[PDB]
Design a protein around this ligand. Sequence first.
Ligand code: CA
Ligand code: CA
Ligand code: CA
Ligand code: CA
Ligand code: CA
Ligand code: CA
Lengths: 315, 105, 53, 79, 79, 79, 49, 49, 98
Amino acid sequence: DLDTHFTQYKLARPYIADCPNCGHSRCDSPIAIEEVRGDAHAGVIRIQTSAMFGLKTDGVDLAYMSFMNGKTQKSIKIDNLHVRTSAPCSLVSHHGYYILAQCPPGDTVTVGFHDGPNRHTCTVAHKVEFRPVGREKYRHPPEHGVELPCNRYTHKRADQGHYVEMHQPGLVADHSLLSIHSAKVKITVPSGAQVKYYCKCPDVRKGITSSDHTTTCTDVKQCRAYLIDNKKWVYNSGRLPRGEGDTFKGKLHVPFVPVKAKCIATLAPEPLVEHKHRTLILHLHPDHPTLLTTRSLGSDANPTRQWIERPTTVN
Amino acid sequence: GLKTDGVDLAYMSFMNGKTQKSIKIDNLHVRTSAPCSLVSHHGYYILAQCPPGDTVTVGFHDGPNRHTCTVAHKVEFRPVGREKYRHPPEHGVELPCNRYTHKRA
Amino acid sequence: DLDTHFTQYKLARPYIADCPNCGHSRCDSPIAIEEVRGDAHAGVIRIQTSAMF
Amino acid sequence: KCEPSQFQCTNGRCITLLWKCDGDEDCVDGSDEKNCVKKTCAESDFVCNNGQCVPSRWKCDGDPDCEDGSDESPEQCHM
Amino acid sequence: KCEPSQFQCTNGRCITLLWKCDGDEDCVDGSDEKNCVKKTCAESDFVCNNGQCVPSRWKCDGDPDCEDGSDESPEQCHM
Amino acid sequence: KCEPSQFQCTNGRCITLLWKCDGDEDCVDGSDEKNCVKKTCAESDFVCNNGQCVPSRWKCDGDPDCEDGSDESPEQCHM
Amino acid sequence: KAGSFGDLQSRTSTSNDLYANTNLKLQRPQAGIVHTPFTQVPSGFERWK
Amino acid sequence: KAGSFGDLQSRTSTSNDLYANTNLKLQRPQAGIVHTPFTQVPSGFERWK
Amino acid sequence: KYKTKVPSPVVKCCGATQCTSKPHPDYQCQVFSGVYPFMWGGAYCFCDTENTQMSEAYVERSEECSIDHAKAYKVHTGTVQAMVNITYGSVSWRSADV
Ligand SMILES: [Ca+2]
Ligand SMILES: [Ca+2]
Ligand SMILES: [Ca+2]
Ligand SMILES: [Ca+2]
Ligand SMILES: [Ca+2]
Ligand SMILES: [Ca+2]
């Protein structure tokens, strides 16, 4: 069932963190790229974001995602969610904070999704590359060849013993809930949000309220506000401020853990052998850079090793 | 930014034949080797942040028409400093550079 | 005339054949790229598929 | 045609037993997501009218946590 | 202003004579596709209501083959 | 927080004073463009009913140069 | 030599007879799919060019 | 030597005692944004491979 | 291959903060003063030009260490054994390792 995998992820919520090159001027993005993993053997990468995929407030669904604008969590159907590095990658799966994709090599990682006319893009620099399997340096997995042992990120969202922790969110500063009532500033607290305040208009008047609390000073610029929401936890990123007290550790499983399976490698064309007195001549005609290693079966091996890129003849 | 009646930044004007058409900017795209991100546009001029490559294209969808043009122009990434990076980092050392203005003046 | 060049393609049908890398795991698709021909001088190419255009 | 510790759907492809109605249709026809029993809900959670289990802390907080909204109905919470 | 083996449309461009009424608009207005005669059907093909040539093997096959659906009419196929 | 020769938007960001309500929302919420007085129109231009200014030469030329069409109205043009 | 200049020789431009050695070798199909994989050295006319 | 082969040594794959010197140096966050930057030398295991 | 984990940094709005010496592989801790951070929805707080950001970090092994890793061995000379195939007379071949 879906509820087994989405058990602890229902208790969590998205967040807004710092993203460099979100548009052109490094805004605060609803989806923020953290900790790209790209060390498989088929060019398949795993991207962890700050949004939530495969989750809706009402119920779990694989065609609905959850994100945050302001302080309100919004749910939008996944319509155009794209990952591109230098060409548009074909994403495999998504589960909570994580996206799995199959990307061509390049120097950047980009994600984006629309809801209405918005764009919501984040780009984080990261050098991904294609890692072939075997002694031939191909640039794409072939139609046919020889099976070789390879390790790749599986597309199953099971537990598999790997965990990450989630924490209570830190105070979040909202400036939209401070307004002037008639000539004094007023605090609007939505649904028991317990807004903290800090005024230094003639002096310090720090304190915690839960309802109304019209502050007795003039300007909105000389007072700050916060918000302690404790309903849903968040993953402790490095782009979020920590809490005040001691914070418990959660246990959120990493869905797409690395496994070891099978990979397809290219087979080189057969060389043409010519026999001479104590001499072996190989006419090699390769299409990819290929490795040729020889040795002798005597007391000294005398090993040779060279990468063949052009059609050469070796004696 | 011009619609033949006033100033509106979500509108563009072009010519088909001898009639000055004017539509709304729906999908204006500039790509070099990956689709670039636009910054601003004012009159004849567009400003965009592009990856390196050998071609510069720009097109716009009027109705069902495509209306694309391409020119061969080699554009390179130019790092500032004594390290040759291929994309500006999240954190580092601030150094003086020269870029085109964000504003229209 | 347009009907002259379609006097033998009318009698043919598309077919479903396997191809590598549909999405992630190499399905059987109505589109199946065979014999990409790129021996041109301007970068132009001709692609033969299994669908009908 | 595989080991009895493996499962085969109506197409013929053989998958493992751990992929039996786990939520993902592994083979083409998706018959692996058809015939299995529904698990029971926890005692510490609150049961909705449609059966969506929510934690008991989320009951009577002034926010919808269910599709049917039975966790915030006046019949289930005296106001 | 070109060779007699070439054809010139009204704009001024010159195309070859093989590109006259062959199916595609080559220059802007497509004047080569405006004034050209129409050839007959073959003797082994059946002519539908709109004039399309379809083979007689496809006649009364139970499936729509013509544009107007005249290949499966009870008027032209005695039932 | 910054120099009085720099403008501080109400979010907290400080921009320069040459960027004072020049058309672009330079801060996040766009409080820069809200409070500055409107500039006068040119004396050699015809003032439209919507505040726009079009060149006199363009008046009664048979082409609508205004948004509301006040430059080609029969009340404003005597034929 | 199948990869240098004479991997495909025809007596005229439209001759029916054709000499061709290219080290073409058949490969086994894998995992139960219908395709014919082969393996051969690249062309000698491209390598000469 | 933090960059060649022994920059991360553990006795067992399920062990709990780790030795790792990777020249990890924290850096100052700039321009008033909430992030934690650092710098360190590249892994010796990926260099050895 | 290692993986470095960064916890959430603490932000003291106007004051000072210190950190202890936690037992961790390659543990690092610092204090940066006068940052004035800018989150979404305005600045974080009011106490100008003196603050404190901790931003600790520490390293750990990665989740790919269970799949591919290099094992370090020290050798010492041991046994040599072989498998022989033998026959004699009218008795057929029988094999056993020695
Ligand atoms: Ca399943
Ligand atoms: Ca509730
Ligand atoms: Ca034509
Ligand atoms: Ca028929
Ligand atoms: Ca402005
Ligand atoms: Ca006019």
